[PDB]
Design a protein around this ligand. Structure first.
Ligand SMILES: NC(=O)c1ccc[n+]([C@@H]2O[C@H](COP(=O)([O-])OP(=O)(O)OC[C@H]3O[C@@H](n4cnc5c(N)ncnc54)[C@H](OP(=O)(O)O)[C@@H]3O)[C@@H](O)[C@H]2O)c1
Length: 314
């Protein structure tokens, strides 16, 4: 299968990228350098991960050394929740650009539909354990995202962790100028997302699957473990691949983009070797059968936010 998917802005997005959430700053520079050396062209970043400077060191070095050209890279970042205000969006994008040592992003996402009170703290909370919201609504944040396209800071804009009515609220927005190119959502065999994926794809919005391996290094982890699931290990054995490779190929065959995270050189290389085998239709349906509606990222402290995404069915 092809290495890239056509977005609704006319650009092509590599269907396999390197995730960087939790990648330690002292390891993520090597991780991104290795990834580019072994063929990754898509890096998934975020200001809230606090490691974009070190990601940027790697990108800049590989550009300087002519390992890759900028036009060949697809760099993604995300606007954090405390910058949903109209007057903060541009500065937030420019800080990310500065840290990444780039003059444009290929894709910039609203990281969550939930706006938080602006300030130094990424998660301002009150005594109920609930986040302090901002009164910005998502349509105004979307228009500020649209301005970044028209200023040349980003080639495409999108959303992340939006449920289907929130996607629809953008798509229905009066005076909408740019449709979201992408909705990045958690997706894996324990959270298969059939309904939201079919909705987005029917609209020409590409879906990116995050936490494809079930985020075994997530801070709040004995819960389900995709990588140790004997049923998935059995499918991997049948194909003479690793469990991780099956878990990465799975979304690819649903016409999703997928962004496994690793800081381990051997795994970074191994995770990219997924274009040389095919899961059968029966394999695909079997993997889908494992859905348990289990989320790595439930945003536990935001469940009373008016824009909390995970109340609605999808
Ligand atoms: N939009 C959002 O709100 C959001 C939320 C979550 C994630 N994301 C993005 O999605 C990316 C991926 O999700 P994630 O970081 O949650 O988790 P993940 O990619 O599902 O899993 C990462 C974990 O799997 C390990 N691993 C990687 N390859 C492996 C292999 N071949 N064999 C065994 N273990 C392997 C990694 O270990 P090592 O690193 O030690 O090798 C790490 O502990 C994130 O990094 C981020 O870029 C976005």
């Amino acid at each position: 299968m092809a290495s890239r998917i056509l977005l609704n802005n006319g650009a092509k997005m590599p269907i396999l990228g390197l995730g960087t959430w939790k990648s330690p700053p002292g390891q993520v520079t090597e991780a991104v350098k290795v990834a580019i050396d072994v063929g990754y062209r898509h890096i998934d970043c975020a200001h809230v991960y606090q490691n974009e400077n070190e990601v940027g060191v790697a990108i800049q070095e590989k550009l300087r050394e002519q390992v890759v050209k900028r036009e060949e890279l697809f760099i993604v970042s995300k606007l954090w929740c405390t910058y949903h205000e109209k007057g903060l969006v541009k500065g937030a994008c420019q800080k990310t650009l500065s840290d990444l040592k780039l003059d444009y992003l290929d894709l910039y996402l609203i990281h969550w539909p939930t706006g938080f009170k602006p300030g130094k703290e990424f998660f301002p909370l009150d005594e109920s354990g609930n986040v302090v919201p901002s009164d910005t609504n998502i349509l105004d944040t979307w228009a500020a995202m649209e301005e970044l396209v028209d200023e040349g800071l980003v080639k495409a804009i999108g959303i992340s962790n939006f449920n289907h009515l929130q996607v629809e609220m953008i798509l229905n927005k009066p005076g909408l100028k740019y449709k979201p190119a992408v909705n990045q959502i958690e997706c894996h065999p324990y959270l298969t997302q059939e309904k939201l994926i079919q909705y987005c794809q029917s609209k020409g919005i590409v879906v990116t699957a995050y936490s494809p391996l079930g985020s075994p290094d997530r801070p709040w982890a004995e819960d389900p473990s995709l990588l140790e699931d004997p049923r998935i290990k059995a499918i991997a054995a049948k194909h003479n691949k690793t469990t991780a490779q099956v878990l990465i190929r799975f979304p690819m065959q649903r016409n999703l983009v997928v962004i496994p995270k690793s800081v381990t050189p051997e795994r970074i290389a191994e995770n990219f070797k997924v274009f040389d085998f095919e899961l059968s239709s029966q394999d695909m349906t079997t993997l889908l059968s494992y859905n348990r509606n289990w989320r790595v990222c439930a945003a536990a402290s935001c469940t009373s936010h008016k824009d909390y995404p995970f109340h609605e069915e999808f």
